């Protein structure tokens, strides 16, 4: 009936990204989505998905969805999914084993990468822990490897972390970067949101 | 174009309080975060003072903490530095500088100002 | 407390090719530091030169680069010119309050 569409180009066709670290968190709300225009990109494409046949959505009218998207190196876009270890699984971002939904990875290297070689993005190294899927964690303090007070000199066992990526015009598919959104969206379908 | 005033520079006894005024022409300053950083003749450029563009949270450097204060309005686009508790070691040119925006989202720890006013001088003399 | 350490003063002929250093007296430079340089006048207000790194600002000639040697911000200038004698600074960032500048370089050009 409605003719009003849920905004997605400006997130996918977007001017700039988000950092490894740290994320946007965006609510969409009362309107249609059409993911078929969404077929439209390059080559470089992957959309696996679990919970539902990656076709039969818009038939459904499940709850509310939730946007975040960020850039990855190359390889361990197997890296990320649900509940396996990893670097930047046990300290970055973790996904429910439970998980409904999926994401969407493609290759952005003429875009980003600068012939000198753009250094824009990093990620942590050292927490001390395994923080749990979903929730958000900014800090900068300079991690202490404990027993004594480093006290804020950067010294031995008491690293700054981050160690930002390099982002070479050329290189191998292997430490190439990688445009990743995952995709989230909510059900018990009780909060009805967006519907077909 | 992009253009910052800064007034109320001049010669105050210690101790005493005053406000430094920044008029911006060109932009919002509610899109950037401003910054005040002060140089000493003979002497080199010294961080003083930056509040982001959401107004959340400010820092400063540990000889200013608990004795000056910053603020900002948005109606009509003016920034307010107000100076108490003077001593003779401030005497000294100020800068306000614009830096990066949310407009252009960038990690934290933001990246810090391209481009400034003219700036205005104060003496601490007693 | 960190301190950034920088070279007091170089002199170079024009046409040259120099290299200026910052660097840190606690530990290693990195690009999550995001190195800043910066070039001031005496009586005037300073004009954006590097940021990112590798970077220009909006209408810099492109015979000034940056980049990382070591654990130090390098910026090399091709074809020194008599204009370029100027205070230098670089500019260095510790998380959330905490930005730190060098000791500062007064490059001249042997006329």
């Known amino acids: 009936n409605i003719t009003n569409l849920c905004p997605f180009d400006e997130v996918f066709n977007a001017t700039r990204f988000a950092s490894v670290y740290a994320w946007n968190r965006k609510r969409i709300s009362n309107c249609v989505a059409d993911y078929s225009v969404l077929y439209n990109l390059a080559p470089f494409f992957t959309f696996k998905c679990y919970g539902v046949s990656p076709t039969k959505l818009n038939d459904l009218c499940f709850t509310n969805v939730y946007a975040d998207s960020f850039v990855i190196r190359g390889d361990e876009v197997r890296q990320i999914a649900p509940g396996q270890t990893g670097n930047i699984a046990d300290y970055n971002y973790k996904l429910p084993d439970d998980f409904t939904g999926c994401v969407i990875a493609w290759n952005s290297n003429k875009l980003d990468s600068k012939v000198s070689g753009n250094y824009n993005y990093l990620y942590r190294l050292f927490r001390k822990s395994n923080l749990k899927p979903f929730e958000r964690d900014i800090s900068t303090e300079i991690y202490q490897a404990g027993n004594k007070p480093c006290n804020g000199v950067a010294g031995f066992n008491c690293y700054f972390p981050l160690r930002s990526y390099s982002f070479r015009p050329t290189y191998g598919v292997g430490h190439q970067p990688y445009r990743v959104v995952v995709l989230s969206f909510e059900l018990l379908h009780a909060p009805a949101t967006v519907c077909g | 174009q992009v253009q910052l005033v800064e007034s109320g520079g001049g010669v105050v006894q210690p101790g005493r309080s005053l406000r430094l005024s920044c008029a911006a022409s060109?932009?919002?300053?509610?899109?950037?975060?401003m910054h005040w950083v002060r140089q000493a003749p003979g002497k080199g450029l010294e961080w003083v003072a930056v509040?982001?563009?959401?107004?959340?949270?400010?820092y400063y450097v540990d000889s200013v903490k608990g004795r000056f204060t910053i603020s900002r309005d948005n109606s009509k686009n003016t920034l307010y530095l107000q100076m108490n508790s003077l001593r003779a070691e401030d005497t000294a040119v100020y800068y306000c500088?614009?830096?990066?925006?949310?407009?252009?989202?960038?990690?934290?720890?933001?990246?810090?100002?391209?481009?400034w006013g003219q700036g205005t001088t104060v003496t601490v003399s007693s | 407390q960190t301190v950034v350490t920088q070279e007091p003063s170089f002199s170079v002929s024009p046409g040259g090719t120099v290299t200026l250093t910052c660097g840190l007296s606690?530990?290693?430079?990195?690009?999550?530091?995001?190195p800043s340089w910066y070039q001031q006048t005496p009586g005037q207000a300073p004009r954006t030169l590097i940021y990112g790194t590798n970077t220009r600002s909006s209408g810099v000639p492109d015979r000034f680069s940056g980049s990382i040697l070591g654990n130090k911000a390098a910026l090399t200038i091709t074809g020194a010119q008599a204009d370029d004698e100027s205070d230098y600074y670089c500019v260095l960032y510790m998380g959330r309050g905490i930005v730190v500048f060098g000791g500062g370089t007064k490059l001249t050009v042997l006329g």
């Open positions: 606690s530990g290693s430079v990195s690009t999550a530091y995001f």
């Open positions: 500088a614009r830096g990066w925006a949310y407009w252009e989202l960038l990690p934290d720890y933001y990246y810090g100002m391209d481009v």
């Open positions: 509040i982001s563009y959401d107004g959340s949270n400010k």
């Open positions: 060109g932009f919002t300053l509610s899109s950037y975060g």
